[PDB]
From a paper:
We recently characterized a novel roseophage, vB_DshS-[name] ([name]), that could infect the Dinoroseobacter shibae DFL12T, a ubiquitous group of Gram-negative α-proteobacteria of the Roseobacter clade. Here, we report the atomic capsid and in-situ structures of the tail machine of the marine siphophage, vB_DshS-[name] ([name]), which infects Roseobacter. The [name] virion, comprising 12 distinct structural protein components, has a unique five-fold vertex of the icosahedral capsid that allows genome delivery. In this study, we use cryo-electron microscopy (cryo-EM) and structure prediction to determine the atomic structure of the phage [name] capsid and the in-situ structure of the tail machinery to characterize the distinguished long rigid tail.
Using these data, we sought to determine the cryo-EM structure of the [name] capsid head, resolved to an overall resolution of 3.63 Å by cryo-EM single-particle analysis. The [name] capsid shell exhibits a T = 7 quasi-icosahedral lattice with a largest diameter of ~664 Å. The capsid comprises 415 copies of the MCP (vBDshSR4C_006), organized into 11 penton vertexes and 60 hexons. The atomic models of the MCPs within one asymmetric unit containing one hexon plus one pentameric monomer were then built. Through structural superimposition, we find that the overall structure of the [name] MCP is highly similar to HK97 gp5 despite a low sequence identity. Similar to the canonical HK97-fold, the [name] MCP is composed of a long N-terminal arm (N-arm), an axis domain (A-domain), a periphery domain (P-domain), and an extended loop (E-loop). Superimposition of six copies of the hexameric MCP monomer shows conformational heterogeneity, with structural variations primarily located on the E-loop and the N-arm, which contributes to accommodate the deferent radius at deferent location of the capsid shell. A hierarchical network of penton-hexon and hexon-hexon interactions mediate the assembly of the [name] capsid. The penton-hexon interactions are mediated primarily by the two anti-parallel N-arms from neighbouring capsomers; these types of interactions are also observed in hexon-hexon interactions. Unlike the covalently cross-linked chain present in the capsid of HK9737, or the formation of an additional (decoration) protein to stabilize the capsid shells found in phage BPP-141, TW140 and Mic38, the [name] capsid is assembled by non-covalent, inter-capsomeric interactions without any additional decoration.
Numbering used by the authors:
A (entry chain D), B (entry chain E), C (entry chain C), D (entry chain A), E (entry chain G), F (entry chain F), ...: 24 to 291
Amino acid sequence: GGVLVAQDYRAGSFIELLRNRMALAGVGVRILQGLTGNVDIPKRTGASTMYFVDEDVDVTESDGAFGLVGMTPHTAGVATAITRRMMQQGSPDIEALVRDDLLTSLTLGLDKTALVGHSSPSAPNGVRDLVIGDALPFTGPFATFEELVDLETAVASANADVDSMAYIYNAATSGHFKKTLEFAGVSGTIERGGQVNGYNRVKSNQITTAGEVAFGNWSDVVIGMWSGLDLRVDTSTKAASDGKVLRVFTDIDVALRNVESIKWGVPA
Amino acid sequence: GGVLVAQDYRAGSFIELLRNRMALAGVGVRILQGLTGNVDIPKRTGASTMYFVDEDVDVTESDGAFGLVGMTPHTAGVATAITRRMMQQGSPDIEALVRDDLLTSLTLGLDKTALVGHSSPSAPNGVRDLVIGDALPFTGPFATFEELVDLETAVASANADVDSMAYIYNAATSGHFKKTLEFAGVSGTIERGGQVNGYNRVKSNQITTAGEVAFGNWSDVVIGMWSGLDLRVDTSTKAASDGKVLRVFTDIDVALRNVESIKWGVPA
Amino acid sequence: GGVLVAQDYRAGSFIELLRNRMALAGVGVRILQGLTGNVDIPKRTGASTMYFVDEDVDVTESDGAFGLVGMTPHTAGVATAITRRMMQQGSPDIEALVRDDLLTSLTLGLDKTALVGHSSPSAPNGVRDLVIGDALPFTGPFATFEELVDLETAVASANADVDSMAYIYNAATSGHFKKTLEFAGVSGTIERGGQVNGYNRVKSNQITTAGEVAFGNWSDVVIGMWSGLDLRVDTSTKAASDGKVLRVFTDIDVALRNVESIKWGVPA
Amino acid sequence: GGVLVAQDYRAGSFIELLRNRMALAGVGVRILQGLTGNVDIPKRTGASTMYFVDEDVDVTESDGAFGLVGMTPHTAGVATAITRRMMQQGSPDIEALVRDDLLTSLTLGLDKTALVGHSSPSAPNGVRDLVIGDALPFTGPFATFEELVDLETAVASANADVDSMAYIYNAATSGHFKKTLEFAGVSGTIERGGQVNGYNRVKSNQITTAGEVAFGNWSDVVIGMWSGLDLRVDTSTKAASDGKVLRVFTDIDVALRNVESIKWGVPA
Amino acid sequence: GGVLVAQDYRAGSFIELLRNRMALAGVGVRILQGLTGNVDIPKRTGASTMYFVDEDVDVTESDGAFGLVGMTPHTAGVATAITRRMMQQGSPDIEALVRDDLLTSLTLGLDKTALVGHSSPSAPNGVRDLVIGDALPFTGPFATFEELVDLETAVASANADVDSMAYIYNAATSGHFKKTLEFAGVSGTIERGGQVNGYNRVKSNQITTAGEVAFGNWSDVVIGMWSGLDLRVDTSTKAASDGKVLRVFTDIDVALRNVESIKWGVPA
Amino acid sequence: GGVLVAQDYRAGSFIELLRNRMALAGVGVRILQGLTGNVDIPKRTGASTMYFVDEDVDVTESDGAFGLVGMTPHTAGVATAITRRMMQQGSPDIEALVRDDLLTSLTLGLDKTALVGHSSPSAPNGVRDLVIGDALPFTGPFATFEELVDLETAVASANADVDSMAYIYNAATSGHFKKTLEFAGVSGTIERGGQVNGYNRVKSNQITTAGEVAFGNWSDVVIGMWSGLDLRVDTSTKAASDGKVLRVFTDIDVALRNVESIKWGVPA
Amino acid sequence: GGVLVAQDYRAGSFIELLRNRMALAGVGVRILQGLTGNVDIPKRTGASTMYFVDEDVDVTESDGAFGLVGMTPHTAGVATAITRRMMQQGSPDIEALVRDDLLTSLTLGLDKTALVGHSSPSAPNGVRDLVIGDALPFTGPFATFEELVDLETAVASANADVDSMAYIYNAATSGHFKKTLEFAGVSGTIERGGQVNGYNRVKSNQITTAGEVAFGNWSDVVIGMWSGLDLRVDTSTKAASDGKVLRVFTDIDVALRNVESIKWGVPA
């Protein structure tokens, strides 16, 4: 009764405790809303000037400029297919395994494209696209403690400070900020406790680049969600040879109130 | 039924969230007064000299010098216009917007001139205009911690010492005072907990220069007011088009008592 | 007379306080299960992707991939003999001595074989056997504080980090961590107060080599025990002279779900 | 019309808040007395010595020297003259201003010349004149902690060390003291809050030189007042114009008991 | 007529304040008991070995190894004899003195020979002799900190670690520890406070050599007291000439459990 | 009427506030007595050895030695002469001055020669005289922290230590201890606070040389005070000029009981 | 009032009971089941052997061999369309009328391909496809009695015999058997009543070819129903003209448990 070829009763047990995928993290500081129709908010962007004048000499007329920000829904959506046989024989089921998979793969996609601009036309330009025009280099594969304060000045130099800001960087950067001394010979390091420079960090892997770090007042970043999550189940699109496709849509747009409330550093 | 046309009914939602353009922050620790006429205050600038003399020899006569400090009203004001159609259909009250912007841009405009002398003639002389005659250089883009002690001495050396002095430096400089140690590996940075060298700072953004830093007893500068912020709402002008014009005037002047009570930084 | 010879009725005492074996210590922070037949676990190893489209544009269908992990029993056993006379006249009860020897000499063998694979060809593949392909050399007889956090970032980069992870290193390596500072001039040593980098250490001797360390989320491995520790008395093998032979068998195997949850040190 | 040579009724508002002159400070730790005649007080120098002898072996004799210190009035005073018209039309009381100038400008002059000797014949010998003979160099534009404690030992090495002792140095030297550590790497400045090397300081401006600093028990300086301040009013002099003259006189002399109670260090 | 020679009638005063000798300290950690006959206690020295079998392959039997440690009374004596005259003329009570000098000397001799083996045959084998076989050299007159934690690791690499272990070293070594730092440029000495490396120390001079330091769990050494210290004053031995002879006997033996529970470091 | 020959009337004031000669300090930790005739005390200096015997072997009798330590009074005195006129016209009472000088000049000489041996035959052996053979050089002008702890080590290395000890060093040595670090990195000075190495310190210029320093249990030094401070007024020594002479005698000697209770520094 | 255009009273009777298609005959003797997921069944092959031992002989061991048979689901289905008009004017409920058309035409089609394999890829191989590897030629258009009894003997020799077997042939071969003798001059015909050789026949036209005759136990054919015959009404396709489409699907597979239980004729 050797187990080799004459006792091949041993088959697969197939315990259904699925090893699920590893997913990234998100953000928790910004603001949002649910609405309909186009939206526009007025912006000041201009102020009157002061004139010093002699006696009996007339002053002039100075008038402020104006402008308005706007948001229009750009739709997004993921869709997948399931043939008949897969539907017939799915061990954890295919009607429910793929269902939540779609939602969890779309929520993170939206959260990523809101932060970093998705490289595709007809897609809402992300925050990194609206502020990369003044990217601060780091003259090194990573950022020293000097630059992490430079970013804070470049934001405070524009009078945009609410003393509740946050840094954002991936993990491979957070590693270097863990094993690097703050100064020449002083005790502390850069990323001690949960803070960095008195402000919090988030350590999210959404920013794919290695040494790319972002800072600024995230409170004035608005995102317009015109609709929730749809999760439309379909059968007719593939029914000649039986099959059931799944799909889910959502539309969104991103904009920020002041262009300089965020600073973006790029590792040179 | 696309949304390009044949769908001209999309509505531009208008939300009332006007945001004032970024503004600076003032600095008040000074001395002021409301009055009329020209003004004058006498000041002693000389003292007698003691003489040691032997038995029965005549002493010498020494005479002190005097001086006075004078101020005269300098005039400054701002104004702008509003037509009729703009006033009627305005989503926020355009009147209130202008009526607030004028006062804000004048209040902020005055003290900046008080610190840094305005570039136009017929404008009052700022503190920087008077004390820049002597000015300690810095031998670098920013001020090493030792120069911040040289300022405190150069005032103490003239025995103008009061125990409530304060530093004033640009916001962009304050970044250079948090990434720099006092001494090599000494465990303390320059600006700690909103204090420097045991004295307070203000960290205003009025000082438009990079590394200029002022210091001294600011209870020794005197500004002269002749009239508060007078808001003249004017409708007789442009009355043929029924468009009113708003204007505001105020006269000011500034001069400090002891020239050696302030010092300037002048990075070079 | 004297106590030299032929005057020896002096009692010889026999106290019952055994000196023990001085074995190693365990680990025990993992998960396990009881089985039958070969087991396979499904594991999702792909994700769908979103598509940004404007009005009236089809969304592309996208699909993920799947995979599964397997386990198969490998058997480990121990056995020993005992005669009748030893049982007849034993100073402590011998059969319990040998039973406890068997049990605690098999449990520790299994623990060691889990982490480091045993040498025999018919042996379960240890964690070191699996995750050694991704190995981070140390460029020295031990590891500095740099690499000792480099492991952490090489784990957390794959999003596979849970708040409660742990380090594992040989007992002859705890001492090196103790005698070395993290950075040059600052105070503080690596093995500091029962932890190393905010995470716990275990300091076992199962790791035979000198400077091998291992870090990762220790809830991501599974050991499959097909049968508990069963004890057989086996009186019949030596009934020709009434001799028992105690033996204990057990067959297990080990595997981990996500390969990027452990990191090996392997100093060079 | 506007301000013009023709239009100028505007008056000159004369506010009587006299900005005063910036004066120096003095000392508060010495002793003195109101006197007459000429004073000589004896002080012992040296004492007898101990001798060891054999049994019935002759003993020898010794002796102890003596000495005395003396003080003689040195006369000093200041005086100025005000005309007649300037008393007729004077905005404050022109007399009282001159009186309160003379009194303080004489008190400070005497306190100045007592500490550091005045540079003129017929002037009393200041402490610097009496103790500069054994002055201690510095080998630097300023003094270092080594000398800041050598000044302490050089007083202790003469048994003249007493519990109450104080440092005295120019205000320009205090800033330098602050901007310099005590040792190489330790975190500590020379002058902490109101303390130097466990002792007090006064930090006046009387010491005209930068690097000079004095130390020692200041209870050994004795100054003698032969007469209070006179403040005599003259009218016979300058009577052809009815002009008053104000004079003050005082005689004084300074001498310290034990020459080693003070130590004086000069920069070099 | 003199004091020196042939006129010396002065009596030489005798004061009974005996200046005693100087003694050592001892040890206070280990365990002991009181017994009558020989004592043997059993310890296991060998365990079964695990095995992995190819399918259908018999597991081989593995047998443990046993041993036992024994203690036999080794007897000591200490005796001295005072004579009659020395007892008739004695300023302190001489037999009250020698009786103390015997007890203290015997206690300290037993203590010293228990720790360091006495250099004589028929003397119980001291702790040092059981572990001096393997000994960690120090490469210098004393052991630095890294060399000091090697004793910790050596016991740790034998699984014999207990929560309360201790260090023992000469008093001359305790100097070389109190005056040397743990790490260069860090504020910490080796023999800090009252502990070393987080473990207790006991300073004693029993270790006659210079830099030998011992370490290990001292609760693992046992010592046997067959009979306490007995005075046993004797007269009839030296009775021919009257005398009082004193002799104190005691018989003990020392033995160790886990040889690895003690590590010995010799300077070289 | 100027102050010259024409003004010789002004007198010469004599004030009786004399100044005492600044003296040294003493000692407050030793022990002494008042006695007559020679003195000596017995000191045990031998320990009875022990032996390990065989089964039936007699312990070999052994003996201890005894030592006797004693002292003999040495003499010492001082004397100063007064003439007749200087006694007739003395501004303070001259005999009072010399009688209050002699007693102190003798006490401070007795203590001086007790601590440090006088350099003259027929003078008592000072504590320096008895321990200078066991001196410990300093390889420099002053001693570092290493030798400062080395003295304490070499004292306690002879079982002669007790909790109440003290250092003694010249004022200059104290100043040097104040100006240096024990380890360059560590904060604090050799003379931090009132202690030096956990024990007290007393400084006094009695020790004449630069960096000699002593340490050890000071309650181990006895002083023999045979006679008080004998005062003698001698008028007949020189009556040919009617001039008396004052003499003061006192006999003393010093010895220490346990010789290894002190050690000396002798900076090489 | 005859039956012409004069009489319009008569209407179309249209009795609803439908006629039917001339469909072939099935089998209905075999086995089936309902399952899910890929399948296999463990069969046996060979067994142990019996041994006749003497009085005291041990009986020996013979190994048993094993093996399995698996099946994979092949798919099939039919579908036809229905216009909107034909659902309004259908005299029976048209969908209920077209269902039966689809279910019977599918069941019969499955019976066809199961017995004789469909000539198309992706079609489950029929019984003829599995056993035709060995079949007795006939040497003529049909088979005599000898071959029809050899078909029985070749199965009975393999012990695959069971009483309820059956022949199968095409209607034409049955007619031929009816019109011919078993042997020349023998009254009995090859086929008579319901038997051919004492066993039953089925006389179906599923075997399209002429002359092929199959024999064997038809209780060894196993077919696997992976899903009931599900009905899918489709309305999304052809939804412009409102026409709906009916569809039906199923997944089956055929495999016989004992390959030698059937034989085939295959004339020539």
